[PDB]
Amino acid sequence: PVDARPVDVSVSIFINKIYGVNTLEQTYKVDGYIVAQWTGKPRKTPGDKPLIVENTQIERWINNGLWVPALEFINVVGSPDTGNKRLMLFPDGRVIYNARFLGSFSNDMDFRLFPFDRQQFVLELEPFSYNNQQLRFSDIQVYTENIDNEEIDEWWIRGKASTHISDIRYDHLSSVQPNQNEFSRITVRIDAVRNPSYYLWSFILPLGLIIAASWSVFWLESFSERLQTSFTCMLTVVAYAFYTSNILPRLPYTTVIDQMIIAGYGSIFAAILLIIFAHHRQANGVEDDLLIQRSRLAFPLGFLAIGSV
Amino acid sequence: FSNDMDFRLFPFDRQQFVLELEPFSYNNQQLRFSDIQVYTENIDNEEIDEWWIRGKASTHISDIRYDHLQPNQNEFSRITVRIDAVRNPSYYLWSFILPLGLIIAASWSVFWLESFSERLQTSFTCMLTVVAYAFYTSNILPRLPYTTVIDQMIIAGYGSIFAAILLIIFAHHRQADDLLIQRSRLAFPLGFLAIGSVLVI
């Protein structure tokens, strides 16, 4: 009439790589190993040595009564690709489960500061069917790749992997037995910063030269020259917008680069207005407001002013 | 298969394609690799292939010791195969680098125009031509988290045309004379190639 204590499960996760970020779906691929270790029923093994049971032989041991609880990735999108898997069965009842996995995982990702964004890649683990009165996680160890030089890396890892063990309490479990609606959850977090070198030298810098060069229209001598050249500048930003889009990640919001593109449109458009205004302002026909046309310094400073905010 | 690949010298990069093999469950007290032999494809002509295999396949047999794991049971036998290859730069030299050079060089011809208006306006068409070319390249060349050799040429083009725009305005709006400093038709290509040389360090 005395209940049995929960089965403690020690977990070790080995992360090989985090890649394949899909900005729109807020997913990312993770390749690694997962190790889970608990103590079950004592059993006989050949020569009383630890026994190794690999892959499809595991299901034969399950059919004959070996207990192997299903551990689910809470935030995995779809069924993960499982490679080799292994059971090490000890005589004293210990079981060690080791498996290779590759899966797509989901997370909350904010790319508004792109290309200077920071992300938190997480894996959440939880038993699929056994609550924390039957099965609980006792500890979680995480191991990651030893980086040599991160210069060629898309992401720069910062800090050691963070981990949590916590209880998830569900309000919609049919049966309502006292303290039978909580599950043990492992959470691992990997913090990283994007390597912005490629986006700084190939995207932001040329766009600054294109926008700056557009301010040279105010150094042309005739109104007709200032107007027709602006359209070449307008066409140069459109050309650059297409070059941007075809390479930058799709997002439901504008990034830093997207706002620079917008700022170039406004500047060029504002210059077209200023050019026309100065040439027709006086409404007399000799509209030659050279003083305002001498805003070759005031227009870039007005731009830089609006951008600071 | 994954490996550490460095494409910064693209399209003149060399890569090491690696295969790593290890028993999943048995340490080197139970299972150890005694030898490894690798046989590759017999090649007829390499001019058609994207990569050129330089040298025979290298192999290694080592031991991997795992801390996270009785004594002397934490060590696994590993085979490593390595195939050294070099990219075929032909396609990228003729269809990408060469046309980009003619574009940058062609942009130096703005100094031979006999009017400030003509010099400053044609420069914008040149700028537009480099941007139109950056799209053509990005649409074909591989995606990377860093710049390549072609990406730097493109940046050099942007810098050349932008620098020329500043020189065209300075010459014309510093005095009232102008045409004589515009006779830098030789000085500009040398300064570009000069900087273009110190970029190769």
Epitope: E145, N149 | D4, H60, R82
Partner: nanobody, 122 residues
């Protein structure tokens, strides 16, 4: 980047030594350092270096569990605790830094070698 080995000397069969390699310069970490050796007449051969995944270390086949690699990232150093020495181990033990590529076991992917430390077993 400059590397300097130390800890060599003479010892009898079955003895022990502790080699040290001090890194000075621009290094991202000690993960990039690896021990090599070269006996007279024999090529320079790999000995040990860190593994790709945490907790793992790559050892040459001849180590046979005798040597153990350790590191003090703070002091910017790696140590090689050599035990159960044998006459065949006599050689000059260099200290290289992986200069790229994906073959930790390949000397061609290492550089900034040190002056080397001599180890002799009788």
């Amino acid at each position: 980047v400059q590397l300097q080995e130390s800890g060599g000397g003479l010892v009898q069969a079955g003895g022990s030594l502790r080699l040290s390699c001090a890194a000075s310069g621009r290094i991202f970490s000690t993960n990039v350092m690896g021990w090599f050796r070269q006996a007279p007449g024999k090529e320079r051969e790999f000995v040990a270096t860190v593994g790709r995944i945490g907790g793992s270390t790559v050892y040459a086949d001849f180590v046979k569990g005798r040597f153990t690699l350790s590191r003090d990232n703070a002091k910017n150093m790696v140590y090689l605790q050599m035990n159960s020495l044998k006459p065949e181990d006599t050689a000059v033990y260099y200290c290289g830094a992986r200069i790229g590529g994906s073959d930790r076991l390949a000397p061609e992917n290492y550089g900034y070698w040190g002056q080397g430390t001599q180890v002799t077993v009788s």
